Design an enzyme around this catalytic site. Structure first.
Site, PDB file in Angstrom:
ATOM      1  N   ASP A 123       0.852  -1.185   0.000  1.00  0.00           N
ATOM      2  CA  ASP A 123       0.000   0.000   0.000  1.00  0.00           C
ATOM      3  C   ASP A 123       0.899   1.251   0.000  1.00  0.00           C
ATOM      4  OD1 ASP A 123      -1.805   1.903   0.135  1.00  0.00           O
ATOM      5  OD2 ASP A 123      -2.848   1.125   1.893  1.00  0.00           O
ATOM      6  N   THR A 124       1.164   1.815  -1.181  1.00  0.00           N
ATOM      7  CA  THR A 124       2.025   3.012  -1.256  1.00  0.00           C
ATOM      8  C   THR A 124       1.313   4.237  -0.700  1.00  0.00           C
ATOM      9  OG1 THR A 124       1.298   3.411  -3.543  1.00  0.00           O
ATOM     10  CG2 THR A 124       3.297   2.079  -3.216  1.00  0.00           C
ATOM     11  N   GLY A 125       0.006   4.224  -0.536  1.00  0.00           N
ATOM     12  CA  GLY A 125      -0.720   5.323   0.097  1.00  0.00           C
ATOM     13  C   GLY A 125      -0.756   5.251   1.611  1.00  0.00           C
TER      14      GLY A 125
END
Ligand SMILES: CC(C)CN(C[C@@H](O)[C@H](Cc1cc(F)cc(F)c1)NC(=O)O[C@H]1[C@H]2CO[C@H]3OC[C@@H]1[C@H]3C2)S(=O)(=O)c1ccc2nc(NC3CC3)sc2c1
Lengths: 99, 99
Positions: free
Chosen positions: B25-27
């Protein structure tokens, strides 16, 4: 580009004739933007995340430029704490994870 | 591996002696896991996302294996709708975005 993750992966987008910054968010299935004026018909939708659910306006077939790449797709507008580019758009610009 | 985004980017992790699946999850700035039994001292924290905030247990210096790569860092445990591997861990395994 290649983007490392030492900072939030924020890029410039153009959508609805307007310029914004947004997070490249592989944990987002959909693209969600803070209140922004987009043209035309929309459908109300409830979406869920960490901490509960929000009401959004769903707009379909919305063109967006994402760090200089063109995509078209669904954009949800509502009270998100951050503008997020989700997989529906990231797949169109050829975005991949690598390790 | 390289991971494309046509599906949710779910990988196998080992943490606290237990096996789980989690989203790359890069967010996510931090790593958040659904209720899981982890050893030792923790601090209560409120964190925010799309739809409001949750109370989590913060555990520091937790070893985790992420698709066969070793990392150590902070893990937040609480009522997340999905197990997410955030940037605090992704930077350690050399995870990058590419388009
Ligand atoms: C910018 C936020 C939106 C960050 N978030 C990560 C997103 O990737 C989440 C992941 C997620 C996936 C799910 F499946 C279910 C979920 F509950 C959560 N996704 C989501 O919002 O997706 C939604 C919407 C997108 O379209 C569809 O896809 C899935 C659904 C659906 C509607 S987080 O979880 O809030 C988060 C994580 C760590 C963290 N660390 C912090 N540290 C402190 C600041 C220093 S703050 C913080 C916040």
């Amino acid at each position: 580009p290649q983007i490392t993750l030492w900072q939030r992966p924020i890029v410039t987008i153009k959508v609805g004739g307007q310029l914004r910054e947004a997070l490249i968010d592989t944990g987002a299935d959909d693209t969600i933007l803070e209140e922004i004026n987009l043209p035309g018909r929309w459908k109300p939708k409830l979406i869920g995340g960490i901490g509960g659910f929000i009401k959004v306006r769903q707009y379909d077939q919305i063109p967006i430029e994402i760090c200089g790449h063109q995509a078209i797709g669904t954009v949800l507008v509502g009270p998100t704490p951050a503008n997020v580019i989700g997989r529906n758009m990231l797949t169109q610009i050829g975005c991949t994870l690598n390790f």
